[PDB]
């Protein structure tokens, strides 16, 4: 249960074995962890304890600007490289991202939408497609529920073998509103 990170102490050895020295703090998580592990990386990297990034990314993009305004990294890189800054509200303009982040989590519909990919796991046919179409659907305030329908096991390989994964896929597309078209992988 304790978040004991292993690649952290292993990445420092690789940098020392070639002729490099780590200066920043790199991390990746999905839930706010305790403060008992924030000071563990500082002593192993000889950095400041108040500069540890605790990112809890899930599956969108609005889980990043909410962290920079709490730790204190938006003003550290300004005086580190001596660059200009157009101050107005908080270093950079944030009102443009707040109007699209809070408004997104206030809509719901749960409409049956059937999509066709290729396999059942996370493939590469809709990694950047399902993300761009979700932001443009905020004008109608409607949420689309994405499912997983495989077109491979649907022909004679399923109807002749075990008719279990065939008749179930047709139960989520007869009353749907948006039916997509897949592609083609040889034969």
Count of residues engaged in binding its own copies, rule: CB under 8 A: 11
| Residue 71 · residue 38 · CB < 8 Å | no
Q: Which region among 39-47, 81-89, 91-99, 167-175 touches its own copies (by CB under 8 A)?
A: 167-175
CA distances from 139 to 34, 79, 132, 144 (A): 38, 40, 14, 13
Could you give the CA distance from residue 143 to residue 132 in angstroms, rounded to a whole number? Answer: 14
Q: Rank residues 14 and 162 by Cβ distance to its own copies and give the closer one.
A: 162
Q: Note whether 157 binds its own copies by CB under 8 A.
A: no
At 15, is the secondary structure helix, strand, or coil? Answer: helix
Q: Which region among 62-70, 81-89, 122-130, 168-176 touches its own copies (by CB under 8 A)?
A: 168-176
Among 168, 177, 178, 180, binds its own copies (CB under 8 A): 168
Could you give the CA distance from residue 23 to residue 18 in angstroms, rounded to a whole number? Answer: 15
Residues in contact with its own copies by the rule CB under 8 A: 162-164, 166-168, 170-172, 174-175
């Amino acid at each position: 249960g304790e978040p004991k990170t292993k690649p952290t102490q292993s990445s420092v050895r690789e940098l020392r074995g070639c002729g490099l020295s780590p200066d920043l703090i790199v991390c990746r998580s999905e839930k706010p962890i305790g403060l008992e592990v924030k000071e563990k990386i500082s002593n192993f990297c000889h950095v400041g304890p108040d500069q540890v990034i605790c990112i809890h990314d899930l599956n969108s993009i609005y889980h990043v600007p909410l962290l920079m305004e709490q730790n204190g990294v938006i003003e550290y890189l300004n005086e580190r490289l001596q660059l200009n800054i157009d101050m107005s509200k908080r270093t950079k303009c944030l009102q443009q991202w707040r109007d699209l982040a809070r408004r997104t989590e206030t809509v719901r519909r749960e409409v049956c939408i059937a999509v066709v990919g290729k396999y059942t796991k996370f493939t590469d046919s809709y990694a950047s497609v399902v993300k761009a179409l979700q932001h443009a659907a905020l004008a109608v305030n409607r949420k689309l529920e994405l499912v997983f329908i495989e077109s491979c096991l649907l022909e004679e390989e399923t109807l002749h073998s075990e008719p279990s994964k065939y008749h179930k896929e047709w139960q989520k597309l007869c009353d749907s509103h948006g039916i997509l078209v897949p592609g083609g992988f040889g034969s």
